[PDB]
Amino acid sequence: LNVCQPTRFISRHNIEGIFTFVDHRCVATVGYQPQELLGKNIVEFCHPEDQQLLRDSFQQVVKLKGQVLSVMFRFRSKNQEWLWMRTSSFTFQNPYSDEIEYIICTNTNVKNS
């Protein structure tokens, strides 16, 4: 059975929240090309009322040491509209290494009030 696919894209972030990889599905999801997000902090695209919650999520995801954290916030699309985004994220480090962990996010436009 065909089902309506949620609109989503994957991104990677440093712990501070800077985009260091963005999947091209971001164009269908939020209207930006990947290189418009790369190098910027995801909090720059976050509604002012949600920016503390989102910054708090970065610290919480690190504390979770690999476990998934889910946060719902409003993301400013390319067309300057607030889209409800559920971001599910977790940290990763190649286990053969001690390089600084990064954060892998799955970002889905969802319904919310």
Partner 1 sequence: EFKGLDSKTFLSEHSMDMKFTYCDDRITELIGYHPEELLGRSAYEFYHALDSENMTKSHQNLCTKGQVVSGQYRMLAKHGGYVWLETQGTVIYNPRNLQPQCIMCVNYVLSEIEK
Judged by the rule CB under 8 A, the positions of this chain that interact with partner 1 are 6, 8, 10, 12, 21, 23, 25, 66-68, 70, 86, 88, 90, 92, 94-97, 99, 104, 106, 108, 110
Cβ atoms < 10 Å from Cβ of 112: 11
Give least dist CB 80 to partner 1, A: 27
Residue of 67, 73, 66, 102 lying closest to 87 (CA atoms): 73
Q: How far is the CB of 110 from partner 1 (least distance, A)?
A: 8
8 or 74, CB closer to partner 1?
8
